[PDB]
């Protein structure tokens, strides 16, 4: 019998920036990842109080 | 299409009374509240007063607490205002705002729409 042996090196997601609010960035996987304003929902474009 | 035109304000004599009233159209007007705001002609905006969606639940400002006495109708989408002393200082253009809630619910954060202004000139003249 034989065995494969590898150490995988470290992984770590490159630094990023906190989005302004209002901002609606193109995300992953086809997703519209919002900040939304105050009082809107999660939609930027529809009220919630 | 949205409008808040206001109506009722002239020229009054200082300790008198007046009657703000401001219409509204095609916006739901039961549904936000209604603030009333001052501006002054060279000394910037001043928040008068506010009446909650209802009708009840009535708070003002400091400088114009019990000064000034406000009041609503849904049936008929009516804001009413009533000044019942006006000193020198209350000559100001006076706005009736739809403010709904967005951080601060009852004082009103968002003012979206604003109506034109009606000019209180009070005067011992």
């Known amino acids: 019998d034989m065995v494969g042996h590898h150490i995988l090196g470290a992984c770590h997601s490159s630094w990023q920036d906190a989005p302004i609010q209002g901002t609606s960035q193109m995300g992953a996987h086809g997703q519209l990842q919002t900040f939304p304003r105050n009082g809107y929902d999660w939609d930027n474009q529809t009220p919630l109080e | 299409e949205v409008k808040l035109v206001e109506s009722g304000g002239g020229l009054v004599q200082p300790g008198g009374s007046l009657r703000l009233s401001c219409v509204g159209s095609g916006f739901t007007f039961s549904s936000y509240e209604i603030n009333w705001v001052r501006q002054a002609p060279g000394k910037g905006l001043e928040w008068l007063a506010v009446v909650s969606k209802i009708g009840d639940r009535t708070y003002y400002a400091d400088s114009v607490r019990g000064r000034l006495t406000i009041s609503r109708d849904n049936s008929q989408n009516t804001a009413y205002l009533q000044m019942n002393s006006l000193r020198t200082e209350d000559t100001a253009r006076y706005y009736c705002?739809?403010?709904?809630?967005?951080?601060?619910?009852?004082?009103?954060?968002?003012?979206?729409?604003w109506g034109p202004g009606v000019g209180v000139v009070v005067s011992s003249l």
């Open positions: 705002v739809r403010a709904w809630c967005a951080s601060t619910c009852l004082p009103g954060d968002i003012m979206d729409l």
